[PDB]
Design a protein around this ligand. Structure first.
Ligand SMILES: Cc1cc2nc3c(=O)[nH]c(=O)nc-3n(C[C@H](O)[C@H](O)[C@H](O)COP(=O)(O)OP(=O)(O)OC[C@H]3O[C@@H](n4cnc5c(N)ncnc54)[C@H](O)[C@@H]3O)c2cc1C
Ligand SMILES: Cc1cc2nc3c(=O)[nH]c(=O)nc-3n(C[C@H](O)[C@H](O)[C@H](O)COP(=O)(O)OP(=O)(O)OC[C@H]3O[C@@H](n4cnc5c(N)ncnc54)[C@H](O)[C@@H]3O)c2cc1C
Ligand SMILES: [Cl-]
Lengths: 528, 527
């Protein structure tokens, strides 16, 4: 019996310091926290893209205003993910190829999808498209974002007012540093820079203590494994099996670097770019004066050298001198994220390519669940089982959504793209696709007020990938319902007034394209 | 083949039938021809129906009917909660609460919303204090302002009309059915045909082609809605869809009921439904205007119809030999599938569970909302049908489990009935909720403690129908509490300290409303 008195976090990367901060804040003065991390070879800041609830679910919980952390972490703004060349054959290039009279790209914005008589706008759009009343792409018809993004507009007016939902772009290293200073200076977390050499377990199989290379021994009531892909505690010591899911996702590697950028001459893109390649895709994460970029590929379809070549050749970099990070990652999740008195947080727990910026999200989402299911020293099995259930559905739902990006691409030009169609969608994903094809909304939000949504975590965790997200991706790639939603034929009054809505977004976007200052313009002011 | 549905035939003209005619008529106004076939049934006494808040927001508001309009025509009263009497003490079936630990044996399950404190339901702070011996006050009186004002039969609205608490209604279903029949036929163009179904003609695909009536008339349609009640004329008889008897979770399958005249001037009116525990079941009391409906829901396995009639009549001091009574044998459970082919079952033809938590009418409009949401065209995409069936299935089973818990967790062991309930098994899904409750976790806590956003948005409420508040009201009320306080609270000394004024605010609302609110009767008079 008794509450948890000591917590030991193993690992000092982004996950480790977010854990120290979140737990240090949530348990302020009722638990002694120590973070243990081995100083080793650091990597290039290849950039990180995020989602809106980073501020409401994480930084707001710590009591850190947006302005404070993003200025210290030299962050930029992200309004969407621009998918480039996912529908056309060809080599890996930063320039969109031509498709049906236009550039091959489509957006997945954080922007809200307007309802109309209890029905998502997406459904009205497809009805008109299917009956030939429109030729306009889904994103440009239902969202105001596409047009102001094509013009690299800021998501905020010079006076600071927000005109749309947005997330952030930043170097993970700087954020980890910011959080380390915060956790140690303001939350009392003890930082020990040493390397774990031996983990001692008791007869119940729980971790008793960890011994470092210098011979120091640390004990705790609860151990948080933030050791990364190695899973030092969860996989190695506790022997919990990692479940590989490469049967759903072929990508398992990446070659990444940071590239200098002339913002003055080219402005700053208010979005992350996902550029389709021959054996994967490449991310582009604009930051201040540079952009992080990385080629995510499948080791089964391209050798590291081929990836290095393809990657450097698209950014016109020199393979021989360009500093490059060659990464190999495991895809999937542990059979159980929390076993005994060991909780895995971060890549030690689960991982999927950054195609939808879920990496950091998985960390604070898991920390939120750990606090919600926080135990005492008796370690009630029920709290552990529930936490584990929340993690598996969180991961598996994203895994499926991401697989859909590859499964439904029309490309058949390379072994990679053709191989993605050979895979099997999880039963849950197949059911969602069937629903989509039948004209149904997928996980429509009970309400269409982003505020409530992006402001209330419980509500967002339960409706993470909603109808808007699915339409952007599926419709963007070319997968559309078999026929218009049956209910529409019974709503003449609705399908008539819907035009007011479509016109409203057209005006909305015409006005923003004229009154909004470029992202660069805003960033200058924003950043001293 | 893919033109929209053009014709719909509703078989059955009771409450479910006219609710369906009204909802579909409103939803598909002018794009579908609706006909309802209704045959004369032997009249029954209006024994009363209790409801929940979303009846107005999810049903009448959808139809565009103001609360005052249907209430006045259906002579309805107000319901603020369900008051459970004598569920924790041994004894005969009586209308008087027995004594338990210094007070009457009752607890309320009201519509009030549990206030969150530092992101944690007030229920957790209450149990923490109770467990540590800091309080001995019951969960409902400590966390809700309703109990105090209900003990005084207060109105949910001030004389000026201002609402002070969430509430639902009490009324004679027959009157609501008539109100809707008139609304649908007069305002929505629904065609009413008084005839009896004699034969249902199906095609080689197993779908219903048409139904032939006793007069020889043949009615064809694209979609058929079975609102024929327990006999499930279409869904069970014609479509042969199996019915899942769930008597392994619910022992009650019968009822004896009547309507009793009441002098509201002399006794006032109770703003709540009473659920009175009996020896082999429980009895409802639904206050209406100048009378109250009441019925003893019992298990034929533990009481004969005669014994049920005697226990029921004696409790109300009525003559068993001459009191007009409605003897009913329920069909408890649900169809394997609510919608099969082009036949959708709505109402008791679809599913039924004893009215212990007032879900009868709710199941009807909730299903109609789900039907429109998954509305098909002539191709009848099987995915719409499957998704519909999953929604209905979970809606029912979750309620089945919730209701079973009322009996499973009662501390009574005085009769074979109460003892047998403890011998049944809880469904795995329910056992998991109990494991969570015992571990100090909230059970399906609402995304937010905003009652309006809750009872105002159906999609929101449907998904979180039985929430943490509902579970604590019933479980803690019966006496089942967590094994220990939520471990999180030990790490929140500031919160467990500042919550003392959240409980104080409740006490202030209890005291102020008790001193300023008129009686339910007073408010009813002025209306
Ligand atoms: C190529 C790539 C691209 C990504 N892109 C995004 C993105 O765009 N957006 C996003 O949100 N997420 C992204 N992610 C995920 C993101 O990087 C991680 O979620 C996050 O940075 C956390 O990493 P980690 O702390 O779990 P990590 O980083 O591997 O840190 C491990 C820590 O544990 C310590 N450690 C290990 N062993 C020992 C030991 N024996 N003793 C002491 N210390 C030890 C190390 O010293 C280190 O501090 C990406 C990941 C990859 C691989
Ligand atoms: C004892 C009892 C207590 C209840 N208490 C509550 C409560 O407190 N609160 C609450 O919300 N709900 C309560 N309910 C549920 C409520 O009564 C029902 O939800 C509602 O009234 C709908 O009944 P129904 O239309 O499904 O079936 P029925 O009333 O059985 O209707 C059958 C209909 O089908 C028709 N029919 C049958 N065969 C044919 C044929 N061959 N041709 C033409 N027509 C045919 C009949 O004419 C009739 O109109 C209670 C139910 C019972 C039995
Ligand atoms: Cl009001």
């Amino acid at each position: 019996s008794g509450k948890i008195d000591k917590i030991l976090i193993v690992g000092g990367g982004t996950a480790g310091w977010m854990a120290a901060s979140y737990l240090g804040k949530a348990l302020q003065g009722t638990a002694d926290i120590t973070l243990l991390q081995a100083p080793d070879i650091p990597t290039l800041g290849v950039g990180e893209a995020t989602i809106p609830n980073l501020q409401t679910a994480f930084f707001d919980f710590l009591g850190i205003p947006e302005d404070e952390w993003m200025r210290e972490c030299n962050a930029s703004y992200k309004v969407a993910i621009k998918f480039i060349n996912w529908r056309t054959a060809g080599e890996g290039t930063s320039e969109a190829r031509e498709l049906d009279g236009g550039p091959d790209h489509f957006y997945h914005s954080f922007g809200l999808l307007k309802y109309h008589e209890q029905i998502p706008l997406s459904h009205y759009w497809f009805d008109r498209s299917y009956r030939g009343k429109t030729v306009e792409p889904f994103d440009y018809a239902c969202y105001k974002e596409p047009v102001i993004l094509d013009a690299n507009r800021s998501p905020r007016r010079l006076d600071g007012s927000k005109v749309t939902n947005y997330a952030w772009h930043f170097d993970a290293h700087l954020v980890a540093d910011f959080l380390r200073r915060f956790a140690t200076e303001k939350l009392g977390v003890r930082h020990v820079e040493d390397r774990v050499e031996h983990v001692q377990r008791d007869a119940n199989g729980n971790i008793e203590s960890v011994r470092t290379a210098t011979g120091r021994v640390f004990d705790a009531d609860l151990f948080v494994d933030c050791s990364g892909f190695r899973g030092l505690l969860i996989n190695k010591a506790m022997e919990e099996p990692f479940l590989d899911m490469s049967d759903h996702l072929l990508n398992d590697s990446a070659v990444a670097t940071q590239v200098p950028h002339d913002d003055d001459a080219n402005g700053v893109e208010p979005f992350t770019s996902a550029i389709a390649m021959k054996s994967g895709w490449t991310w582009k994460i604009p930051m201040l004066g540079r952009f992080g970029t990385g080629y995510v590929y499948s080791s089964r379809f391209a050798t590291e050298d081929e990836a290095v070549r393809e990657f450097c050749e698209m950014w016109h970099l020199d393979p021989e001198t360009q500093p490059l990070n060659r990464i190999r990652f495991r895809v999937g999740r542990n059979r159980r994220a929390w076993v005994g008195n060991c909780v895995s947080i971060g890549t030690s727990s689960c991982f999927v390519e950054p195609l939808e910026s879920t990496g950091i999200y998985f960390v604070y989402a898991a920390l939120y669940q750990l606090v919600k299911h926080f135990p005492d020293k008796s370690l009630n099995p029920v709290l552990t089982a529930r936490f584990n259930r929340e993690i598996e559905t969180m991961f598996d739902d994203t895994r499926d959504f991401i697989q859909a990006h590859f499964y439904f691409s029309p490309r058949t030009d390379t072994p990679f793209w053709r191989a993605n169609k050979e895979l099997r969608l999880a039963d849950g994903m197949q059911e969602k696709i069937d629903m989509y094809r039948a004209g149904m909304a997928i996980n429509a939000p009970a309400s269409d007020d982003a505020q409530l949504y992006y402001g209330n975590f419980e509500e967002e965790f339960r409706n993470f990938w909603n109808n808007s997200n699915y339409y952007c991706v599926l419709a963007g790639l070319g997968l559309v319902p078999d026929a218009p939603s049956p209910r529409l034929a019974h709503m003449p009054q609705a399908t008539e007034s819907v035009d007011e809505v479509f016109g409203a977004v057209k005006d909305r976007q015409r006005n923003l394209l004229e009154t909004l200052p470029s992202l660069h313009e805003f960033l200058r002011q924003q950043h001293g």
